Symmetry: C4
Subunit: 165 residues, 4 copies
């Protein structure tokens, strides 16, 4: 186990892009790889620790593969919702992503409103995350905060979800 | 199409300098390469994402090519005048350039006053944007701001342009 | 002598992890390597300067070896305690670690209470260093300060131990 | 000429360390190399622009050669004092050096008080400038400012030397 997740993380980015472009295009390999990450104790938090430390373009290429293959995004965020603490590990890496990555994540959700709402329901069903999530937004810089407001109200129903919390 | 721009972006910097140098040394290749970026849906925002995430020295070498080869700078900021989200996307990635890169970009424009004024007109001829440009001065470190001030005061005309708004 | 520590620092990170994964799995090599670093004049400062500048995953992985091999963690902070000024250089690089590394370091100590208290003793034992540790903990992002309190409060004894100082 | 400084800057760090460890051990090569940088129009500001963007350990290893070969440090701060902008191109990169590098630079001068005095006089002999040095130390982290004050207290003569301006 452990040597695989470091071997992956220390490949050159082109090989990691190729590895993920194989994996999340084949549901039969995706499903069982996330079984491997939960069969070894805590190993899903070692895969996510390695993930958030990647070159930021590989992180956006990964979220671009999931959001555009949404038959696997709802399942992926079911693993991190079922496993306690992993949702808090997500947000406390999301706050630290270099801001182009936060912008591309935000675009990818507001441009696919089903996958925004489904993600936003998991922040209720993993308990107590919303006060931290509101604080993440509140600690962003004034440029990103202004731009996210101007971007979000391109769909005022998602503005209402953001007001409902 | 898109995998070419990833392949390009993941090359070692010397290959990208060599590619961008051979590209903009040939106006007949420059024009059509941007037609390829503009005809594929949305793809120019994916090339520009890959640009702002480059090694900082390749970003200055690229601007150092255009401004000192300016018969292609006049065309380049025409493409970003055409596409209404792209000028917003430029400034809100400019603010996230390294302070040494912002300093060198400002030197590069103020030392070529025609190409300063042309860029400054595009901020008015594109919708909105100009209040982002002002705040993206005002949000910088006090040392950077004093330096960029003591730089621009060399030209009372370019001082008049920035102070007219 | 000095060339070994630069050659090591400039190897690709997999070779460094291989080198450390051998070294602190062999106590007969561990004690010899650190004796060479204490004996050559100032070389223990040059190994630690090269350590805090590493790729953040090699830094996490190194602490992940020591804390789980505590028969060597005991010795390691004995060497720094027997080299006055090194405990200053420790904290004054810890404050500059990437937040994901500080978070994992804290996690590794509170999940191994003996090795938290052992570390905490040397903050008294190196003359007056404790005040710099308290001050550094006050100088972190406000959501990370609350996250470290929420994490530490999982053990009320160690929660008491940081409050009784 | 100009392409040499990019070919150099894009070599792997071991080659740059080798190239510099050859150069500032041979005064006959050192004076010639900087004469080329002085003669080609603006090229010394292109070398310094490439220098301050280096991997931070190469920046320290370079100053660690000069200060310990001070018979070449005296000449080096003729060049950067003679071009009237170049001293500002030091300080407006020095404020942007990573904090561990600024600490190791400061330590390296405080351990050689005559080379500290030599550098400090060149700030006054280059036009104006000294108020930027006072501002730079006032803008560092509170931990760094406190630590540099306690580090400089190791030499009361240099405490007087920084107080007398």
């Amino acid at each position: 186990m452990k040597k695989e997740l470091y071997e992956f993380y220390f490949m050159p980015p082109l090989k990691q892009i190729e590895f993920l472009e194989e994996l999340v295009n084949n549901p039969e390999k995706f499903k069982e790889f996330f079984k491997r990450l939960k069969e070894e104790p805590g190993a899903m938090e070692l895969f996510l620790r390695n993930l958030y430390l990647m070159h930021p373009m590989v992180q956006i290429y990964f979220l671009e593969l999931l959001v555009e293959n949404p038959e696997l995004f709802k399942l992926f965020f079911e693993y991190l919702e079922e496993c306690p603490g992993a949702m808090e590990q997500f947000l406390l890496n999301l706050y630290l992503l270099h801001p182009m990555v936060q912008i591309e994540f935000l675009k990818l959700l507001v441009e696919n409103p089903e996958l925004f709402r489904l993600f936003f329901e998991y922040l209720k069903r993993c308990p107590g995350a919303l006060e931290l999530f509101k604080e993440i937004i509140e600690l962003l810089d004034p440029i990103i905060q202004k731009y996210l407001k101007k971007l979000l109200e391109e769909n005022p129903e998602l503005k209402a979800l953001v007001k409902e919390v």
